[PDB]
């Protein structure tokens, strides 16, 4: 169920020269490369220990591909300002996400590409990877142009072949980290918020991959504050689910943790 | 990067014959393949453009096919005419799809049919006296190869065909000269 994904951001800064451009690569929930045009000679650099082995060949090629994307996205930002009839003075964001997934068998499962203009779905590569599709009516000219150029074909070949090829290569390099399931170290903390109510916070700490389900239940029979999954900064993730309960009735509530790295779902109950 | 090979580099064919100019490219992820004609001391003019989505384009006696999988184009020139004589250049999109990468070109020579060859060498006097002269080898067959002198003192040019439209007559010629006093008779071979 592994994936190779890149997240590209182009931000126009009119008057202050070339748009800001950043690429980041992930294998599953592990960043392994990045490019930032904010530098003298901006290059693709390793962002995972297991990626330092690669040669000048890789870094020169990835640098070239990253610089080419930045140049094209600088053009795209002009084109999109034009399409939406926007001022040349304003900053605008273009985002491009692409990824290939492997199945249980370790073969190509699926590929996807989307780009967003100013945080909104703009243009989507269809399920079949045969054509690009306008989301709103403003992306219609991009769909016509992309199909006329058969953009989908070049992206399909990437997602089906070279994306899958290199995912397998990355999974091999640093299999120590990438293929290891780190289960969540789970506990429940109690936080009296008022005279009549307390917060029960169910913790999942130092887990990998990022996928995890935290649910609160009540014995006999729940509304949950679910905080955004966050990096610990060591490649593992933290999450907590909170439920407001009547003070004194905390032990009626169970937290349920589901994680790949757990053989079965874990149930916790607060003990005084 | 994208790399373009054109096979062969030079082609000499009798007029009326069919011929293939070939173009192969290492990276098959191209948007467009384009064939150009380039006459001596002139720019390139686009003959045919084939989109990656298309399989062939035809322009008169020119048919260009595109095979992405094998990664090549064949430019078929039907019933070749001397007017087809030029440098033919093949270009495909670079990997970025931002500019065109060119091959080294195929120089095509469609040799004119000399109806009645009359090979003869002649001596020509400088119009402005001087007792300076040149030797003219003319009216020989288009399949006749002109030998280089290999001597530093004696100069011999390659052939060129001229067209006397008015007389519907074509003729080859090569020129030979020297700054010595020691003959045209045995100058060319």
């Amino acid at each position: 169920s592994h994936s190779l994904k890149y997240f590209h951001t182009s931000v126009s800064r009119p008057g202050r020269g070339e748009p800001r451009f950043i690429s980041v690569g992930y294998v599953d929930d592990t960043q392994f490369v990045r490019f930032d045009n904010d530098a003298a000679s901006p290059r693709m650099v390793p962002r995972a220990p297991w990626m330092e082995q690669e040669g000048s060949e890789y870094w020169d090629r990835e640098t070239r591909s990253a610089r080419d994307t930045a140049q094209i996205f600088r053009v795209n930002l002009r084109t999109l300002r034009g399409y939406y009839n926007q001022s040349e003075a304003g900053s605008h964001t273009l985002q491009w996400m692409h990824g290939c997934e492997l199945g249980p068998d370790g073969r190509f499962l699926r590929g996807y590409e989307q780009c967003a203009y100013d945080g909104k779905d703009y243009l989507t590569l269809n399920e079949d990877l045969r054509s690009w599709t306008a989301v709103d009516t403003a992306a219609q000219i991009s769909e016509q142009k992309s199909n006329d150029a058969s953009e989908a074909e070049h992206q399909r070949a990437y997602l089906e072949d070279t994306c899958v090829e290199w995912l397998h290569k990355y999974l091999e390099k640093g299999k120590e980290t990438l293929l290891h399931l780190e289960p969540p170290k789970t506990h429940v903390t109690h936080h009296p918020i008022s005279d009549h109510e307390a917060t029960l916070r169910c913790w999942a700490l130092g887990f990998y991959p990022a996928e995890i389900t935290l649910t609160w239940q009540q014995d006999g029979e729940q509304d949950t504050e679910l905080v955004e999954t966050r990096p610990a900064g060591d490649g593992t993730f933290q999450k907590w689910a909170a439920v407001v309960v009547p003070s004194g009735e905390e032990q009626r509530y169970t937290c349920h943790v589901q994680h790949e790295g757990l053989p079965e779902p874990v149930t916790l109950r607060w003990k005084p | 990067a994208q790399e373009v090979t054109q096979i062969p580099a030079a082609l000499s064919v009798p007029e009326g014959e069919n011929l293939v100019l070939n173009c192969s490219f290492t990276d098959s992820a191209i948007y467009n393949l384009q064939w150009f004609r380039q006459d001596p001391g002139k720019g390139l003019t686009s003959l045919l453009l084939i989109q990656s989505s298309q399989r062939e384009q035809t322009s008169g006696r020119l048919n260009a096919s595109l095979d992405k999988s094998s990664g090549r184009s064949t430019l078929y020139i039907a019933a070749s005419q001397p007017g087809d004589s030029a440098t033919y250049l093949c270009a495909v999109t670079n990997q970025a799809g931002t500019a065109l990468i060119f091959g080294k070109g195929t120089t095509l020579s469609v040799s004119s049919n000399i109806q009645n060859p009359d090979p003869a060498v002649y001596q020509l006097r400088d119009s402005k006296s001087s007792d300076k002269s040149v030797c003219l080898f003319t009216d020989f067959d288009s399949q006749t190869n002109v030998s280089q002198s290999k001597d530093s003192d004696v100069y011999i040019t390659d052939k060129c065909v001229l067209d006397m439209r008015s007389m519907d007559f074509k003729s080859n010629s090569a020129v030979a000269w020297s700054n010595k006093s020691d003959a045209c008779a045995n100058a060319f071979n």
């Binding site: 080419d68 053009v75 991009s142 990437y158 | 970025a96």
Partner: peptide, 9 residues
Amino acid sequence: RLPAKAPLA
């Protein structure tokens, strides 16, 4: 590995 080509909108 990045794709060689970025879509031209």
